[PDB]
Amino acid sequence: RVSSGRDLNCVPEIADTLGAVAKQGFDFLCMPVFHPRFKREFIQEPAKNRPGPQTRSDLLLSGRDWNTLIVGKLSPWIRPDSKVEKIRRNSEAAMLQELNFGAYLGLPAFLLPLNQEDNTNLARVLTNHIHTGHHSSMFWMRVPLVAPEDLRDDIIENAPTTHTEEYSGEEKTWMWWHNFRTLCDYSKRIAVALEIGADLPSNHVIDRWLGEPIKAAILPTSIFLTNKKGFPVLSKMHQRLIFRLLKLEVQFIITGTNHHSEKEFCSYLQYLEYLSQNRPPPNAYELFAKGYEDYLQSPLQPL
């Protein structure tokens, strides 16, 4: 009843790894298409002429597996908006390389980070990629509810966390996304993978992401509290959000290592399945309207 996958930034054997996460009860796997630490040079010899292969083979999985179970991740070293000329050009080439390889495999969706404010060059490369060739892959933009800067522990003695009232400040991750999608003239193939922190923001921020195209919600293991037995669970504030996301029919992405060491990963997932099958069951109106959700109908003259 709940669609949910697993984020890993580490895959030794794509055969066994995908086999494991499916045996854990997941629907799909977010993973790298190139090794995240494997930087590539595209201009300067000798690094330029590095012998291949440049990544692992597409033969290791079936088309059906590539088309359904795998979600690409842009290598984290790719920074198209660097203020360094060389890193910019290399990340420009790296991104097309990574995105093109995703098209080749025919992945249903591909993950890209929004973790700073200026993504003007990241948007352009993607915009050129979307208008270059023909495909209907999806692009999940990884945006956090709360910027990593405003989530950091107040432990830098000579640069403290300004505690003051900040209304327009604590919304800023939304202007990150809004600026990005605007540059990409509201492409239907650009959507939101909404990353959730341990600390939620004020409701007024969670009110921004109303009306936005949320395909995914990224739950790190961190945010999960433990209960009396040892089961991992969530706050009543993180539950209120899960119930609102469920209404929007989004896929859930478990990221990061196991912190409830005694129990497996199908425990994190079990809880979501628990929350899901307990939610206020669908009423009279909502049962007849099921399917018509955000479906436009031209004006018909009854005369």
Partner: protein, 322 residues
């Protein structure tokens, strides 16, 4: 101008009849180039131009075991996504025997020259996927006495009647372009509900290598079709035959169609307005192959029994990008 998707390669790798035929075209070429007295002394340098994921490379290795003649392989591929797949086979299985080259064959500066060049660049209309332009640019690294597989291919046209396919084309009109554009381009199509009005005659032919000192891949060709019923012309079905080597051939020409081979469907050159044709009359169609430095395109026209407008002048509606 665009790279093929992994799953596209996958399907076309599964046509055994096509790769049986390519295996044999080499098998017979190996034996004719290196005598039995030279079978261990002479190693043949063999280049797959457009190697893909390497079903032609594997096939060249099967041909070597069959003929028991020695060979060295280059696998030149433009699509880097495919090259990932080659370099992974190269490491795991093939080894030093197979060099891999992530390059366009028109660009690649070859370390040595080749005995045999092996490519499958043919489209449904033969030269439409630009086999001529690619091998023209890559022949200067073929040995003076070297073979091309294929050596010869020929395009074939036949007039067809299908008010069904005429609708299918008419409905391909899209906003933000010439509203007749959909008529000035060829469609690959498993022709089904149609009427072949005359026996296919050949249109264009190409030879590899190309001896002629002033190479020119542009063509003009007048074809005349006897028509022995009343009917309405809606388009022209396109097919090809190719000589891989000697008597070994692939064909989608219905008369000589290679049995069980699904790799290629027929093409279709439609016409804007359907032309009424009466028992006894001759359909006269004209076909031009045209090119810049940048793009290659077909233009075409009907001159009998009535004149059409020239389709795709300047390649305005349809060009294939070099």
């Amino acid at each position: 101008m665009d790279n093929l998707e992994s799953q596209t390669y996958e399907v076309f790798e599964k046509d055994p009849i096509k790769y049986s035929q390519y295996q044999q075209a080499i098998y017979k070429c190996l034996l004719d180039r290196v005598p039995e007295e030279e079978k261990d002394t002479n190693v043949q340098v063999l280049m797959v131009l457009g190697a893909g994921r390497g079903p032609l490379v594997n096939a060249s290795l099967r041909a070597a075991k069959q003929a028991d003649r020695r060979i060295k392989l280059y696998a030149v591929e433009k699509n880097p996504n495919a090259v990932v797949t080659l370099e992974n086979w190269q490491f795991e299985e093939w080894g030093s025997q197979v060099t891999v080259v992530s390059s366009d064959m028109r660009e690649w500066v070859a370390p040595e020259k080749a005995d045999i060049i092996v490519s499958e660049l043919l489209g449904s209309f033969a030269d439409n996927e630009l086999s001529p332009e690619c091998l023209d640019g890559a022949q200067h690294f073929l040995k003076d006495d070297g073979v091309s597989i294929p050596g010869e291919y020929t395009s074939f046209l036949a007039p067809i009647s299908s008010s069904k396919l005429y609708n299918e084309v008419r409905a391909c009109r899209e906003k933000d372009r010439d509203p007749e554009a959909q008529f000035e381009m060829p469609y690959v199509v498993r022709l089904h509900n149609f009427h072949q009005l005359s026996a296919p005659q050949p249109c264009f032919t190409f030879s590899h290598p190309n001896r002629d000192p002033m190479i020119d891949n542009n063509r003009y060709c007048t074809l005349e079709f006897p028509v022995e019923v009343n009917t309405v012309l809606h388009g022209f079905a396109g097919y090809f035959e190719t000589v891989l080597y000697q008597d070994i051939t692939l064909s989608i020409r219905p008369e000589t169609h290679s049995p069980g081979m699904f790799s290629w469907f027929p093409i279709l050159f439609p016409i804007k307005q359907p032309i009424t044709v009466r028992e006894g009359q001759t359909i006269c169609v004209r076909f031009w192959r045209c090119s810049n430095s940048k793009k290659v395109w077909y233009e075409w026209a009907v001159t009998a029994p009535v004149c059409s407008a020239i389709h795709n002048p300047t390649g305005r509606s349809y060009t294939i990008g070099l």
